[PDB]
């Protein structure tokens, strides 16, 4: 259970930093990963 919560914690910590990186190259990774629309709806 702690491992699961840590995994959810580390992935949103990726995306919140990914929001301001680069205009084409790095931003696109955020849109590969979320196609399921509960990412950043747990925020």
């Amino acid at each position: 259970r702690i491992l699961t919560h840590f995994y959810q914690g580390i992935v949103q910590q990726f995306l919140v930093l990914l929001t301001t990186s680069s205009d084409e190259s790095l931003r696109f990774l955020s849109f590969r990963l979320d196609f399921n629309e509960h990412y950043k709806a747990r925020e």
Binding site: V11, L17, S21, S25, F28, L29, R32
Partner: protein, 242 residues
């Protein structure tokens, strides 16, 4: 351009620099990484380069790399990392393509360094990926034996999708490196070599090719904090195996 491209085979070198180092080939690399596995699990202090060169040769002979020229397989040979008190072979390994003609005027040594850095990244990634598919391996062997004990169902049901949440993340990352890091730069590289009729334009194209690839991975100086998180995705992988 004629005498450099037929007498020293300069075009086949760049094609094989993308193939083996930059992972454009890959029965060869999967067979290398499969056959090199029990050595690299042990620390590299008890390993030397001749023990790599042999198994590399058998990797080359059995796979599709055999019907490629003996020169360019000969110019690629094994290398290691000089030792440190926490040596793993997965920490300590490299390939070296070294210069054997006038191609040093085309390929600088720091260009081989950036080559080896992105090689280090795409090594750590397919490293964790094979650990990941061994996790899925433990899943489809053990779960069909655990029908006969009903009480463990909840925790095994839980661990499966903690694993599947990782296996998807690697099934985005291996596919982000496929569609953006080795066709884009490769298309524009291929264009501005094969249309160009001056050596310096080919040189300046290969340079910015590898350099924008550096920015496109998280191997830049400013994206390093991004990199730092990504290393934390690799901890919970090996933790999960235990």
């Amino acid at each position: 351009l004629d005498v450099l491209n037929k007498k020293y085979s300069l075009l086949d070198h760049m094609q094989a620099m993308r193939r083996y180092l930059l992972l454009g080939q890959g029965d060869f690399i999967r067979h290398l990484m499969d056959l090199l596995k029990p050595e690299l699990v042990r620390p590299a202090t008890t390993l030397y380069q001749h023990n790599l060169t042999g198994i590399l040769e058998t990797a080359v002979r059995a796979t599709n790399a055999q019907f490629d020229s003996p020169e360019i397989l000969r110019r690629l040979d094994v290398r290691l990392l000089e030792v440190s008190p926490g040596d793993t072979g997965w920490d300590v390994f490299s390939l070296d393509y070294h210069v054997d003609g006038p191609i040093a005027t085309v390929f600088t040594r720091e260009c081989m360094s950036h080559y080896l850095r992105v090689f280090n990244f795409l090594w750590r990634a397919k490293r964790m990926e094979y650990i990941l598919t061994d996790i899925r391996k433990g899943h489809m062997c053990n779960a069909k034996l655990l029908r006969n004990m009903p009480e463990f169902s909840g925790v095994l049901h839980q661990c499966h999708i903690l694993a599947s949440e990782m296996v998807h993340f690697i099934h985005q990352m291996q596919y982000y490196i496929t569609f953006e890091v080795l066709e884009c730069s490769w298309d524009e590289l291929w264009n501005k070599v094969q249309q160009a009729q001056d050596l310096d334009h080919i040189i300046a194209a290969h340079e910015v090719f590898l350099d924008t690839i550096i920015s496109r991975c998280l191997l830049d100086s400013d994206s390093r904090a991004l990199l730092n998180q990504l290393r934390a995705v690799f901890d919970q992988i090996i933790e999960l195996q235990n």
